[PDB]
Design an enzyme around this catalytic site. Structure first.
Site, PDB file in Angstrom:
ATOM      1  N   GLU A 125       3.697 -16.154   9.726  1.00 37.75           N
ATOM      2  CA  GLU A 125       3.662 -15.019   8.817  1.00 37.75           C
ATOM      3  C   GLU A 125       5.038 -14.533   8.344  1.00 37.75           C
ATOM      4  OE1 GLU A 125       1.118 -12.072  10.361  1.00 37.75           O
ATOM      5  OE2 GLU A 125       1.312 -10.722   8.648  1.00 37.75           O
ATOM      6  N   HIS A 138       1.731  -2.916  11.190  1.00 41.73           N
ATOM      7  CA  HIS A 138       1.316  -3.874  10.180  1.00 41.73           C
ATOM      8  C   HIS A 138       0.668  -5.115  10.795  1.00 41.73           C
ATOM      9  CE1 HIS A 138       1.100  -5.932   6.349  1.00 41.73           C
ATOM     10  NE2 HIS A 138       1.509  -7.005   6.999  1.00 41.73           N
ATOM     11  N   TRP A 154       0.792  -1.232   0.000  1.00 42.99           N
ATOM     12  CA  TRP A 154       0.000   0.000   0.000  1.00 42.99           C
ATOM     13  C   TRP A 154       0.824   1.281   0.000  1.00 42.99           C
ATOM     14  CZ3 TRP A 154      -4.843   0.064  -1.277  1.00 42.99           C
ATOM     15  CH2 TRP A 154      -5.705  -0.997  -0.944  1.00 42.99           C
TER      16      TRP A 154
HETATM   17  N1  LIG Z   1      -1.645  -2.431  -3.135  1.00 45.72           N
HETATM   18  C1  LIG Z   1      -2.949  -2.743  -3.189  1.00 45.72           C
HETATM   19  N2  LIG Z   1      -3.717  -2.153  -4.109  1.00 45.72           N
HETATM   20  C2  LIG Z   1      -5.077  -2.446  -4.197  1.00 45.72           C
HETATM   21  N3  LIG Z   1      -5.602  -3.372  -3.294  1.00 45.72           N
HETATM   22  C3  LIG Z   1      -4.776  -3.934  -2.388  1.00 45.72           C
HETATM   23  C4  LIG Z   1      -3.465  -3.637  -2.331  1.00 45.72           C
HETATM   24  N4  LIG Z   1      -2.941  -4.360  -1.323  1.00 45.72           N
HETATM   25  C5  LIG Z   1      -3.908  -5.088  -0.772  1.00 45.72           C
HETATM   26  N5  LIG Z   1      -5.048  -4.827  -1.441  1.00 45.72           N
HETATM   27  C6  LIG Z   1      -6.444  -5.325  -1.249  1.00 45.72           C
HETATM   28  O1  LIG Z   1      -6.554  -5.337   0.209  1.00 45.72           O
HETATM   29  C7  LIG Z   1      -6.967  -6.647   0.651  1.00 45.72           C
HETATM   30  C8  LIG Z   1      -6.232  -6.947   1.990  1.00 45.72           C
HETATM   31  O2  LIG Z   1      -4.795  -6.955   1.776  1.00 45.72           O
HETATM   32  P1  LIG Z   1      -3.718  -6.274   2.782  1.00 45.72           P
HETATM   33  O3  LIG Z   1      -4.107  -4.888   3.119  1.00 45.72           O
HETATM   34  O4  LIG Z   1      -2.375  -6.525   2.177  1.00 45.72           O
HETATM   35  O5  LIG Z   1      -3.865  -7.142   4.145  1.00 45.72           O
HETATM   36  P2  LIG Z   1      -3.797  -8.735   4.370  1.00 45.72           P
HETATM   37  O6  LIG Z   1      -5.113  -9.343   4.115  1.00 45.72           O
HETATM   38  O7  LIG Z   1      -2.613  -9.331   3.729  1.00 45.72           O
HETATM   39  O8  LIG Z   1      -3.435  -8.684   5.925  1.00 45.72           O
HETATM   40  C9  LIG Z   1      -2.526  -7.676   6.370  1.00 45.72           C
HETATM   41  C10 LIG Z   1      -2.189  -7.760   7.870  1.00 45.72           C
HETATM   42  O9  LIG Z   1      -3.434  -7.485   8.597  1.00 45.72           O
HETATM   43  C11 LIG Z   1      -3.607  -8.545   9.522  1.00 45.72           C
HETATM   44  O10 LIG Z   1      -2.900  -8.275  10.659  1.00 45.72           O
HETATM   45  C12 LIG Z   1      -3.028  -9.702   8.740  1.00 45.72           C
HETATM   46  O11 LIG Z   1      -2.870 -10.841   9.584  1.00 45.72           O
HETATM   47  C13 LIG Z   1      -1.700  -9.162   8.278  1.00 45.72           C
HETATM   48  O12 LIG Z   1      -0.734  -9.096   9.324  1.00 45.72           O
HETATM   49  C14 LIG Z   1      -6.454  -7.509  -0.461  1.00 45.72           C
HETATM   50  O13 LIG Z   1      -7.111  -8.792  -0.452  1.00 45.72           O
HETATM   51  C15 LIG Z   1      -6.823  -6.702  -1.707  1.00 45.72           C
HETATM   52  O14 LIG Z   1      -8.232  -6.625  -1.883  1.00 45.72           O
HETATM   53  N1  LIG Z   2      -3.066 -12.335   3.104  1.00 48.64           N
HETATM   54  C1  LIG Z   2      -2.560 -13.434   3.697  1.00 48.64           C
HETATM   55  O1  LIG Z   2      -2.600 -14.525   3.149  1.00 48.64           O
HETATM   56  C2  LIG Z   2      -1.956 -13.341   5.043  1.00 48.64           C
HETATM   57  C3  LIG Z   2      -0.909 -14.202   5.381  1.00 48.64           C
HETATM   58  C4  LIG Z   2      -0.365 -14.118   6.653  1.00 48.64           C
HETATM   59  C5  LIG Z   2      -0.871 -13.179   7.530  1.00 48.64           C
HETATM   60  N2  LIG Z   2      -1.865 -12.381   7.194  1.00 48.64           N
HETATM   61  C6  LIG Z   2      -2.416 -12.418   5.992  1.00 48.64           C
END
Ligand SMILES: Nc1ncnc2c1ncn2[C@@H]1O[C@H](COP(=O)(O)OP(=O)(O)OC[C@H]2O[C@H](O)[C@H](O)[C@@H]2O)[C@@H](O)[C@H]1O
Ligand SMILES: NC(=O)c1cccnc1
Length: 180
Positions: free
Chosen positions: A129, A35, A26
């Protein structure tokens, strides 16, 4: 004992995007606590410098299943179609992937936490993770599992295919914690 050569990521975005473009984080917020509590992700400030992955495929399946179940509940209550497609990407880790646990312990033993208050109601989690700093190139992305749920018939169909752009290189995750 070696760091993992392979990790997994649940994401809502389809391989037409991810196989070609990879994953980009992001933003530039590389605070590990923000995070891991979720504060800097999509549901928070959406500026995290990390792309989360797991050494455990099962972890990402549980995550996918939870989001699917939210769609199922939405249909049962008349607030959705029930349709859901989720993707689990299989990814080759390299030295830009850092273990969340070691990164977390180093971070909080140095700058401390504020449990429940970083994100509101969230504890920092980190078990299997791994955090990719800023980006995962498309060349690292090996294959995807597509889970398709028909919201009205209830049928769930799973298919798998490989990424033509995948490059077979010899890499593993970083053995060291992430430090800013
Ligand atoms: N760069 C991007 N651009 C557009 N959509 C995005 C992008 N990145 C993510 N998405 C969308 O955002 C959705 C969520 O992706 P995220 O924000 O990475 O988070 P997570 O799910 O990995 O978890 C991140 C941490 O939060 C908790 O603590 C977890 O355990 C981790 O430690 C994606 O499926 C896309 O729809
Ligand atoms: N998006 C994921 O699969 C993921 C993996 C580990 C921890 N949180 C999210």
């Amino acid at each position: 004992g070696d760091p993992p050569a392979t990790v997994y990521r649940y994401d809502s975005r389809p391989p037409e995007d991810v196989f070609q473009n990879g994953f980009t984080a992001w933003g530039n917020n590389d605070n590990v606590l923000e995070h891991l509590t979720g504060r800097s992700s999509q549901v928070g400030s959406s500026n995290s410098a990390f792309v989360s992955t797991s050494s455990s495929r099962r972890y990402t399946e549980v995550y996918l299943e939870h989001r699917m179940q939210e769609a199922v509940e939405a249909e049962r209550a008349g607030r959705g179609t029930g349709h859901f497609i989720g993707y689990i990407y299989e990814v080759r880790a390299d030295n830009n992937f850092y273990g969340a646990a070691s990164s977390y312990f180093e971070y909080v033993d140095t700058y401390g936490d504020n449990a429940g208050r970083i994100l509101a109601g969230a504890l920092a989690t980190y078990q299997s993770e791994y955090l990719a700093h800023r980006r995962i190139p498309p060349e690292n992305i090996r294959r995807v599992t597509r889970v398709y749920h028909n919201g009205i018939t209830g049928e769930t169909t799973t298919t798998e295919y490989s990424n033509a752009r995948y490059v077979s290189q010899q890499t593993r995750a970083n053995p060291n914690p992430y430090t800013s």
